[PDB]
Amino acid sequence: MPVITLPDGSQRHYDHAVSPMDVALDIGPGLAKACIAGRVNGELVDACDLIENDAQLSIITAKDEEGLEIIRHSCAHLLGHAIKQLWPHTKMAIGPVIDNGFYYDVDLDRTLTQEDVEALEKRMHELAEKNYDVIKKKVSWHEARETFANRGESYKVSILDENIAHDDKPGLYFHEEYVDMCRGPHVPNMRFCHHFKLMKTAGAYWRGDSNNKMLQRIYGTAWA
Ligand SMILES: Nc1ncnc2c1ncn2[C@@H]1O[C@H](CO)[C@@H](NC(=O)[C@@H](N)CO)[C@H]1O
């Protein structure tokens, strides 16, 4: 029975757990449509995350700096979704947000040509324009590892084996048949990710160690 207080001081009493999206829809259709994520007691959370206890809630939209960062991060997931369709054997490493954009380091046997990059961007636009929902599932360290092992995603498994505590609960984000892992938040639907472009590619050693494989870094930019 969390008591939710909004920035304006208005309060809402609930006798069941509610998500930022649930509260946004209670306020109005416009706010629900604009909702990308929420901030609960100072912490950024996905719009679908349940609030069980009393809390201060704010709704994050594309007009917020946090909203732009989330859109950029979700565009990295979109790149993965598309590249796994074009070259299924590709292995995804790390895809973070950077100042004015994002990048994703990938392991695939073909050295990407400019035509390949253009094909990748084209597929990304096609997929994003389907306006599919991003489905989030909070899971155990072990379920996350099984999920990526079953996909042959060795770098994701390595991140779990060496960089994530066994008691941590990773967030899995499903984009149709594609799945990625992140602390998030991520957009609730890809309709928020139509404005982006791929830029250049570069090379980067996995974990910055020259004893490891040289990956391909694909750079992109995205905006509201
Ligand atoms: N404790 C944790 N729980 C959930 N996700 C975690 C995590 N520690 C690291 N990550 C994710 O692993 C990738 C490399 O840091 C990062 N994510 C990614 O590279 C893809 N989502 C592409 O954006 C990062 O979010």
Curated annotation (Swiss-Prot):
Species of origin: Escherichia coli (strain K12)
Localization (cell): Cytoplasm
Region (N2 domain, the editing domain): 63-224
Effect of deleting the gene: Essential, it cannot be deleted.
The protein's name in its UniProt record: Threonine--tRNA ligase
Region (Correctly edits mischarged seryl-tRNA(Thr)): 1-224
Free-text function comment from the UniProt entry: Catalyzes the attachment of threonine to tRNA(Thr) in a two-step reaction: L-threonine is first activated by ATP to form Thr-AMP and then transferred to the acceptor end of tRNA(Thr). The rate-limiting step is amino acid activation in the presence of tRNA. The zinc ion in the active site discriminates against charging of the isosteric amino acid valine.
Family under the similarity heading: Belongs to the class-II aminoacyl-tRNA synthetase family.
Residue segments, region N1 domain: 1-62
N-terminal region which includes the editing domain, important for catalytic efficiency, its loss increases mischarging with L-serine, deacylation of incorrectly charged tRNA no longer occurs, partially complements a deletion strain: annotated span: 2-224
Range covered out of full length: 1 to 224 of 642
Lineage: Bacteria, Pseudomonadati, Pseudomonadota, Gammaproteobacteria, Enterobacterales
Record text on subunit structure and interactions: Homodimer; binds 2 tRNA(Thr) per homodimer, each tRNA contacts both monomers and makes specific contacts with the anticodon and acceptor stems.
